[model samples]
Structures are given as structure tokens and as C-alpha cells.
Target: MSWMQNLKNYQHLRDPSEYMSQVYGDPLAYLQETTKFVTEREYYEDFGYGECFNSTESEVQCELITGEFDPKLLPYDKRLAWHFKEFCYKTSAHGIPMIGEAPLEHHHHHH
Candidate 1:
């Protein structure tokens, strides 16, 4: 089997956050906080739930519903890349890593 195939067999055992941090190094605190922000603010407005209903998915799954925020349009105080980075982790664990390089993609597009 190819390396990817081998990886697929064990992918289920990996945690999105843990996997992401391992690949991208520790995420910034603000990124973590913003995940909380989006999670708390949008989860209910968008999905009517604070956490993922699917036990197989993580709370970060919500990020999939919403695409990446345009960093240029948004303020600089908040860390947008980290939100995307976190989102990439969850999305990748779910079997699709956004698109483009590594687990981190250039933008958000649902395939």
C-alpha cells in the first residue's frame, strides 16, 4: 500500500487538533480564542447548536459551513489564519483538506 493508503487506515485514530498542531506547530492563543468566538457566535446562528451533533466530527466542524474570512477585509487584531488552520485540521480529519498545500489551504472551498 502507498503511504497515503497506510495513513488512511489510521486516520480515524487521529485527533484534528492534535494532528494540526503536530503539522503546523502550536496554534496562536488568539487563533484559539477566535475559534471560541466563531464557535460561540456562529454555531447557533448557523447550525442552531453549540457543538457538532455528529460524534465522529469535532466542534471545529462548524468551520466547514463557513468559508475562510478575508484577512484583508477583516481587522488585524484577530488571527484569521489560525481559524483557517484549525478549520483545515477538522476538515482534513473528516477526509478532505480544503485545497492546496499541506493541511493548510490558500482559501476555503467546499469540494
Candidate 2:
């Protein structure tokens, strides 16, 4: 199988965050802060929640709602992380243009 597939195969035996520090660094800090900011209803207020609860062909599993950790937008060392320096910055690097990427959608809310 491919590397991505290999990673997936053993994911059930281990958590992804096990090595996230090396690959993604401490973006969780930014994640929590941004989510707190957005929770005030300043953005994407029109979107609804929990489509996974609405319907699906497969069985419904648990959900993990996380926020965006835009490394470029945040100040500090947000973008310094590297899963493999040579790979991420050399042979296969797209560099600056590769500095973006999203979130999960689901669940109801009451407030």
C-alpha cells in the first residue's frame, strides 16, 4: 500500500497526534484561539451543523470537530513545522503556495 494508506492501516492502534509535534508543531494553540474568536459568531454564521447526523449510507461514527490552523496567517513559528525537511522543503516542496489548507462539519448546538 501507499504511505498514506500505510499510515491509515495502523491509525486505529495509535493516535495521529503521536508525532504531530514533529510534523505539524504546536498549531493546536492557534487552533483553540481562532476557534474561540469565531465562536463569537463573527464568521460563517450562516452555516448549519451536524449533517453527519442528518443522514449517511454508512454507519455514523464519533466526530472530532477541529478548527483551522493557518500557519501563514498566524504570527510566530506557525509555519516552521516539517514532517521531513528535505521532502517538505526540497524535492517535493511547493513552499509558499503550499501554505494553506480546512475543517470538519457536523453536530448540533444550543445557546
Candidate 3:
């Protein structure tokens, strides 16, 4: 089996709630804060993914592919950085142009 397949299988045994509780003291609080952060942020739709931008367009997007984390965690920023880097990498992998920035205010269609 491929590594991705192995990862998917392994993830079944991983308890995210337990992990979050161990790391953040309160899993529910962490969940609430992170959820609020992501939901309240402005995001743009690109290649079927939500892309959150920083003040400067040159910065990496904040849209994470996996579960969210509380910003209080040091790894949270690192994860966001990696997430954006992966986004750009995938964009190139798919032969998509990674130019131009989205408007700060734009409507996202959810259907």
C-alpha cells in the first residue's frame, strides 16, 4: 500500500480529542477558539479550497487542509506556514498559475 493509504489507515486509530486535550489543557476551549478564528476570517475560493490571506498578498494563505489548532500553540503558526507552502506546491503540481490576489471582500458559494 502507498504511504498515503497507510496514513489514512493510521488516522483511524488517532483520537484528535485526546491529543488536543493533552496539548491544550481544554479540548473544548481550543476547538471553540480555533473554529471561531477560521470561521470569522475572510477566505477566497481557489481550486475548491478556502484560501485565507494575510495583510500582504505575498504572504501564505491560512486555509488549512486538516483540522484547525489554537493559535496559542507554537506549532499552530508552523502548521499554517506549512499548509500554505503545500498549497503553493500543489498549485504547481497541478499546473495552475499561482498569481493574482483575491479581493479582501468576496462572496463564497457553498452548495
Candidate 4:
């Protein structure tokens, strides 16, 4: 097995369904791929003069669907932080929206 599989085997964290399919060539690849459209980069960068994601995790769509963005919130990078704020604005203007974090009760559901 690959070293990545070893890390995945032992790690407590779960991969997002889309990420897993991207890595594994799963049958649902199209829907998984489409999920990227809900991201800020798709809305911002593809259409015109605007930003692309610095990293996938920097986008709110990944955070909301995967619950991974919160851990990095402290001592934030000013550029990324600003882009995230811009993401919110663009999402609102486009009438596409995102949720910030899962509810506290959802944490218990994960466990």
C-alpha cells in the first residue's frame, strides 16, 4: 500500500467524500467534481478578474462540507483572511451561499 494509505488507516480524521473519489477514481466523480463549483474559486476566478483559491482548504465550501477549516483560524494570514471575506461577499451577490461551521451538535454526530 502507499504511504498515504498508511496515514489514512491510522488517522482519526475522515476524508471528505469528494476528496476520496478524486484520489480513488470512484464512480461518483462527476458530482464530486461539481462540488468545486460551490467553491469561491469557481465563482470568482473562472468568470473574470478575481481570485482563485490559494489552497483548497482556504475556500469556505471545502470548510463547510468537510469541517477542516476551523483549526487554522488563529493567527490568520491577512491575504487569505481577506479573500475569505471577499468570498462571502461574492457568494451573497451571486445568490450562492455557504455555511461557516457545522452546528455544535454535529460534532457529537461525528463521534
Candidate 5:
């Protein structure tokens, strides 16, 4: 089947979590597995941004990324944030969004 067809079929056959587990493994596993892709530049740069979910546990200490953008910005960061939000929303069924690290907070003066 074509890639598109396969995606559609996969979506239909499995719920978000099932599909993610089957394809990417658990969230932490997914993050660990994709390190190579990010380092190799096969994936987007932002894909490399994330933080460990917790420090207490080892195996369960998965990393999660949140994408936050400047609300005042016209595009650039705003666009990136929007895409990241959408991606997270889309995959929410599997788990929380791991799109990218949350944007740093800063006060800005609007002219």
C-alpha cells in the first residue's frame, strides 16, 4: 500500500496510543530512539528539544517537550509554535505533545 494509504489504514485500525506504541514505542523510548535522527539532521532541529519528565525514576523518566511561542510575534516563532501545537494536538491520543521545548518567557514592549 502507498504511504498515504498505509497511514490512513493504520489510523483506522488503531487508536493513537496503540499506533504510537507500535510505531514509536512509548514516549520516552520514542524520544531516546529519535536522538539519532535529530543528531543526524534527518529530523527538524526543534525535534531535539525536550526535558526529562521526572528525575526520580530511570525507565519511567521520559522526556516531554512543549512548544510555546511569542504571542506578539507576527510569524517566525509564532508559525513554529502553531505547527508544534497542531502536532501535539494530533498525537494527543497517544500521549502529551513532545513537539519542542517550551519557549522562554520574556516581557516585550509593544510599540
Candidate 6:
């Protein structure tokens, strides 16, 4: 619903996970609660400082996840995007670095 509602030690796009947990962790649920209309691009842009995403019909992450920002590549649902992203936030910071997207890299310890 709201972006950057408040902050304790805000660091632009790289704010601490506790603060990120308030929104980026579950953007769709946050939007459903805080906003009621689409002035959509503002939030979309808000997400872009260092955000990446995906939808059901396309690749597992957004086109820009590599380095491009073609607006047409955006997702109307954005739901899947955040779920995958949120998963990263929860685990990656603790040791779940992404190898492409799945973060299942153990440097490939398993096989």
C-alpha cells in the first residue's frame, strides 16, 4: 500500500531486511492493504532502485533482472515476482546466494 512509510536507518534501496520485511517481503499484500488505486508506476519505479521480478508467463525473473528496464516486460500480477524475491530475502542474506535464480548453488556440492 505505502512505500517508504517510515525508516529507522534508511539506506536508499539497500535498507535493512527488517524494514524491507515490512513491504518488499510481500509487496502484493502490502499494496492490497495500503493502496486502493493504480498510480502504479510510482511504486513500480520505487521498486526499481535495485529490484527484480517475474510473472507466470515469462522467465522466472523479470527481464531487467539481468540489466535492462524495458517497461513492457513488467508484470500485471507481480505476485510471482515478489514471492521469488521474498524467498531470496529470507534465505539469501543468511547464506543463500543465487546461482542464476534458484540459489541452489552449494557451489554444487551435491552431485
Q: Work out the TM-score per prediction.
A: 0.19, 0.18, 0.17, 0.23, 0.19, 0.18
What's the true lDDT of residue 37 in model 5?
16
lDDT, candidate 6, equals: 0.31
The residue-by-residue lDDT of candidate 6 on 17-102, one tens digit each, is: 42343333336433532442222433333232122221123332333332222224323245434433442222232243331243
| Error of model 5, residue 89, in angstroms | 16
| Per-residue C-alpha lDDT of model 2 across residues 1-75, encoded as one tens digit per residue | 123223322223334432232123233322322333112121222222221111222122212311222233222
Candidate 6 residue pairs in clash (backbone atoms < 3 Å): 1-30, 1-31, 1-34, 53-62
User: For model 6, what is the error of residue 57's alpha carbon versus the real structure, in angstroms, after optimal superposition?
Assistant: 19
**Tens-digit per-residue lDDT, 5-103, candidate 4:** 333222234445423422222223223333442333333322211111112223335313322223242223454344333332232322222223212
The candidate that achieves the highest lDDT relative to the unseen native structure: 6
- Winner on TM-score between 1 and 4 is 4
Off by over 4 Å in 5: 1-5, 8-10, 15-18, 21-25, 28-101, 105-111
Model 1 Cα lDDT, one tens digit per residue, 14-103: 334422322222233223333443333222222211112121233333434322223343232233344433433243343323222233
Q: Residue 35, candidate 4: how far off, in angstroms?
A: 24
Q: What's the lDDT for candidate 1? A: 0.30
**Candidate 2 residue pairs in clash (backbone atoms < 3 Å):** 50-106, 50-107
lDDT of 5 by residue, 8-78 (tens): 22223423432233122225432432332121221222332222211122232123322221123213244
- Per residue, candidate 3 scores C-alpha lDDT tens digits across 71-101 of 3322324443343233322332222222224
Reference-based lDDT, residue 81, model 2: 35
Q: Write down the lDDT of every candidate, Cα atoms only.
A: 0.30, 0.25, 0.29, 0.29, 0.28, 0.31
Model 3 scores what on Cα lDDT? 0.29
Clashing pairs in 5: none
Give the higher-lDDT candidate: 3 or 5: 3
